Amino acid sequence: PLTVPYDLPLPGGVMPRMLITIMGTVKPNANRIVLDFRRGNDVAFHFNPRFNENNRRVIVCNTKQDNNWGKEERQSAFPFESGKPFKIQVLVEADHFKVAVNDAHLLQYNHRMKNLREISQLGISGDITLTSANHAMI
Numbered sequence: 001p002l003t004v005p006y007d008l009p010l011p012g013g014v015m016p017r018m019l020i021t022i023m024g025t026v027k028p029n030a031n032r033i034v035l036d037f038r039r040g041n042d043v044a045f046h047f048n049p050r051f052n053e054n055n056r057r058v059i060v061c062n063t064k065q066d067n068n069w070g071k072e073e074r075q076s077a078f079p080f081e082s083g084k085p086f087k088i089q090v091l092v093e094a095d096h097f098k099v100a101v102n103d104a105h106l107l108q109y110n111h112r113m114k115n116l117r118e119i120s121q122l123g124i125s126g127d128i129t130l131t132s133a134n135h136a137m138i
């Protein structure tokens with residue numbers, strides 16, 4: 001039963017075989033959800049479900065370095081729904097993150113910021129209630 005914006009510490013830094021699991025519920029009338037894997041002031045991986053982009057829903061992913069966003073990657077498979085619970089898993093692999101939502105594979109995002117051990121925190125914000133957020137080594 002946790003506070004949003006929530007900062008999940010990642011005290012090792014990230015590395016391959018780290019699995020982050022987030023459980024929550026999308027608020028009625030949600031506009032946005034964000035997961036930010038932060039490296040200092042940079043964002044190595046931003047995962048941003050958007051509920052109204054010109055009346056469509058789309059997940060936007062990107063990397064922010066020195067205050068500049070890179071090329072956006074989009075996924076229009078959109079498994080989130082206003083008022084419904086969800087489970088997000090982010091798996092860290094050597095070359096990419098894999099994201100799964102409700103046990104369905106959703107997208108892969110290749111690492112652009114490859115100093116993974118400097119990613120020290122995951123911010124979780126937007127229009128959700130959060131039940132739990134944890135990382136585990138597998």
Ligand SMILES: O=C(O)CO[C@@H]1[C@@H](n2cc(-c3cc(F)c(F)c(F)c3)nn2)[C@@H](O)[C@@H](CO)O[C@@H]1Sc1ccc(Cl)c(Cl)c1
Nearest residue numbers: 032033034046048060061062063069070071072125126127
């Ligand atoms: O200013 C804009 O309205 C929000 O800015 C977003 C930028 N953003 C959104 C948020 C954000 C913050 C929150 F508190 C939330 F709860 C949330 F769900 C999202 N933080 N940063 C990235 O999504 C970025 C991805 O490329 O997209 C834009 S910035 C941007 C604008 C144009 C281009 Cl093409 C690019 Cl590459 C980036």
Ligand SMILES: [Mg+2]
Nearest residue numbers: 103104105106
């Ligand atoms: Mg599927």
